[PDB]
Amino acid sequence: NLYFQMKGKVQKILIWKWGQPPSPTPVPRPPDADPPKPLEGRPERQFFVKWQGMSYWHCSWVSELQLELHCQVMFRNYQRKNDMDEPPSDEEKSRKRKNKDPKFAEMEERFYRYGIKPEWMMIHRILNHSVDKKGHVHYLIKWRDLPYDQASWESEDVEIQDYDLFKQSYWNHREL
Numbered sequence: 608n609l610y611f612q613m614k615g616k617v618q619k620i621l622i623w624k625w626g627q628p629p630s631p632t633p634v635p636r637p638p639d640a641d642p643p644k645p646l647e648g649r650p651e652r653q654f655f656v657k658w659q660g661m662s663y664w665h666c667s668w669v670s671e672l673q674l675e676l677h678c679q680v681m682f683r684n685y686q687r688k689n690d691m692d693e694p695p696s697d698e699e700k701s702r703k704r705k706n707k708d709p710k711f712a713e714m715e716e717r718f719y720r721y722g723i724k725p726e727w728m729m730i731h732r733i734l735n736h737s738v739d740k741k742g743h744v745h746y747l748i749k750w751r752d753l754p755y756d757q758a759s760w761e762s763e764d765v766e767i768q769d770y771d772l773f774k775q776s777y778w779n780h781r782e783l
Contacts, residue, residue: 609629609631609633609634610629610670611653611667611668611669611670611673612667613669613673613677614658614661614665614667615658615659615660615661616658616659616660616677616678617656617657617658617659617669617674617677617678617681618656618657618658618659619656619657620654620655620656620674620682620685621655621656621657621666621721621722621723622654622655622694622695622721622722623652623653623654623655623694623695624652624653624655624694625650625651625652625653625694626650626651626652626653627647627648627650628647628648628649628650628651629648630645630647630648631645632644632645651670651671652670652671652691652694653668653669653670653671654668654669654670654671654674655667655668655721655722656668656669656674660759660760661759662727662728662748662750662759662761663718663723663727663728663750664728664761664765664767666718666721666723702715702719714728724752726750726751726752726753727750727751727752727753728750728767729750729751729767729768730748730749730750730751730767730768730769730770730773731748731749731750731751732748732749732773732776732777733746733747733748733749733773733774733776733777734747734748734749734755734758735747736777737760743762743763743764744762744763745760745761745762745763746760746761746763746774746777747759747760748760748761
């Protein structure tokens with residue numbers, strides 16, 4: 608991925624940071640070469656977004672240009688309310704102690720430090736399911752500390768804490 612993926616429609620910008628420009632260095636060398644480096648570009652703004660209809664697991668980054676081309680009205684509002692030269696920053700000393708767990712560390716670097724509460728990515732319960740013509744199943748999930756109306760679908764094949772434990776609960780208590 609030499610560039611940012613558009614996953615759907617952007618719902619919200621959670622945060623932004625300055626970042627290095629796309630670079631070609633990442634293009635694999637052929638197996639028949641032996642013993643090239645580009646000059647560093649102007650940093651640009653990168654944006655962490657939530658997508659419409661999708662849980663916090665899917666939050667990813669987009670470029671200023673993608674926001675300009677695809678959410679100009681909502682991006683125009685964002686720019687006018689926010690400082691666009693300096694980016695944004697009980698809750699404190701326990702982000703520290705909880706972090707010595709490596710799955711937490713990883714989630715913290717990837718998600719929580721950009722404004723996602725840990726609970727928002729935890730299954731509260733499964734509400735329903737759907738099947739493709741393929742037979743792949745999706746589950747409509749209520750997340751912890753988020754309303755029912757913010758329930759969202761996830762593929763069965765995803766890796767969320769105790770996903771499978773909840774699936775079995777859903778399925779056991781469904782013909783009772």
